[PDB]
From a paper:
The T3SS is a specialized apparatus employed by many Gram-negative bacteria and symbionts to inject effector proteins into host cells. The T3SS ATPase utilizes energy from ATP hydrolysis to separate chaperone proteins from effector proteins, unfold effector proteins and eventually force them through the central channel of the secretion apparatus. Using a crystallographic approach, in the present study we reveal atomic details for ATP binding by the highly conserved T3SS ATPase Spa47 from Shigella flexneri. The ATPase domain exhibits an α/β Rossmann fold comprising a twisted plane of nine parallel β-strands that is sandwiched by seven α-helices on both sides.
We performed a screen for truncations and eventually identified a variant lacking the first 83 N-terminal residues (denoted Spa47Δ1-83). Spa47Δ1-83 was highly soluble and eluted from the size-exclusion chromatography column as a monomer. In the unliganded structure, two Spa47 monomers are present in the asymmetric unit (ASU). Using PDBePISA software to analyse the crystal structure of Spa47Δ1-83, we did not observe an oligomeric assembly, consistent with the results of size-exclusion chromatography. The overall structure of Spa47Δ1-83 is similar to that of other T3SS ATPases, including the monomeric Spa47Δ1–79 N-terminal truncation. It includes a conserved ATPase domain spanning residues 84–354, and a C-terminal helical bundle domain spanning residues 355–430. The loop connecting α10 and α11 is missing in the electron density map, reflecting an intrinsic flexibility in this region. In the unliganded Spa47 structure, a number of water molecules, and a SO42- ion occupy the P-loop. In the unliganded Spa47Δ1-83 structure, the side chains of the catalytically important residues K165 (Walker A motif from the P-loop) and D249 (Walker B motif) are connected by a salt bridge. The luminal loop is located below the P-loop and exhibits relatively stable folding, as demonstrated by the observation of sufficient electron density for this region, and the average B-factor of the loop (residues 305–315) was 81.9 Å2.
Numbering used by the authors: -4 to -1, 84 to 380, 398 to 430
The structure:
Amino acid sequence: GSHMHTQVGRGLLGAVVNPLGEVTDKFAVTDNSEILYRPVDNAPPLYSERAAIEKPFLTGIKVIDSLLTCGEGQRMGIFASAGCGKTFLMNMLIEHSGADIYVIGLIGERGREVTETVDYLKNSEKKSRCVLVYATSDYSSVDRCNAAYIATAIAEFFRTEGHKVALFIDSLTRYARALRDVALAAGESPARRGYPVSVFDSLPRLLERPGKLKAGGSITAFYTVLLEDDDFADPLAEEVRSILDGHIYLSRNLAQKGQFPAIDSLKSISRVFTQVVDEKHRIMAAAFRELLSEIEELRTIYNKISVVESFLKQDYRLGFTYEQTMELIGETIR
Ligand SMILES: [Mg+2]
Ligand SMILES: [Mg+2]
Ligand SMILES: [Mg+2]
Ligand SMILES: [Mg+2]
Ligand SMILES: [Mg+2]
Ligand SMILES: [Mg+2]
Ligand SMILES: [Mg+2]
Ligand SMILES: [Mg+2]
């Protein structure tokens, strides 16, 4: 029973907040200083309170805005091994999208990693729209957990205000590991992979707090899962794969090969694709995948590779409008 409240409001915009609710850096100063307190534990919305996911959440990233289109209110998994560009991708998603407010939660990262992110925010137009909650690796399992809840809570308040909120949580694997430790310390039995069954049981309550509301406002959430290399095939990834509305997988093959972002579209899916894009889009996109699968058949030892790879590849500094992306799609299937 967390009776613990935390600060929420426009006064946090620009702020870097720690697991104890105090501000330790800024990447922007905000003209408003609204601060209220709100509970860090909160039930997800009632089913009757949710709106259908129908309007797309545009990312300004060609390959996902076209083949893996996201909806406002959705929850999307990001599954990456190390050094495959995951943090560049998170930063792309923040930069080239159109949310009113971005809440980021970094869980158990090294202080260098939290600084990468803060550095990014300090040089970005979104600086006045973001809040960063972190728990560096010198913090306790409890503090790491509360970092995730504080992040969600702040998002929740901005959603109740009406805003289109984007929530990023990096990582769920360190959140789960911290939750595990808390559970072992309370004396419960380890199920498969040393995790007490309660860590996986609690996930839905955390991961279903996002969504779009009838009353106005939405949280669209991106959750990171750090993969090992073919190690145990990964219980947590599977759980997340099943709880969420789709998953983007970052490929090693594509990462070493220079193909950034290293998004493998074969291993990826938005489970709300059908219902956030045109009939026209579906067909153009379906045609692009056909073009892909066939280009993959040549990769077993024609000229439309350069043009396609040029479509996929995208420097983290560039954002493409939906029209631009679809414009580009049209020329590769014509
Ligand atoms: Mg786009
Ligand atoms: Mg990151
Ligand atoms: Mg400490
Ligand atoms: Mg709350
Ligand atoms: Mg994991
Ligand atoms: Mg583990
Ligand atoms: Mg499945
Ligand atoms: Mg239609």
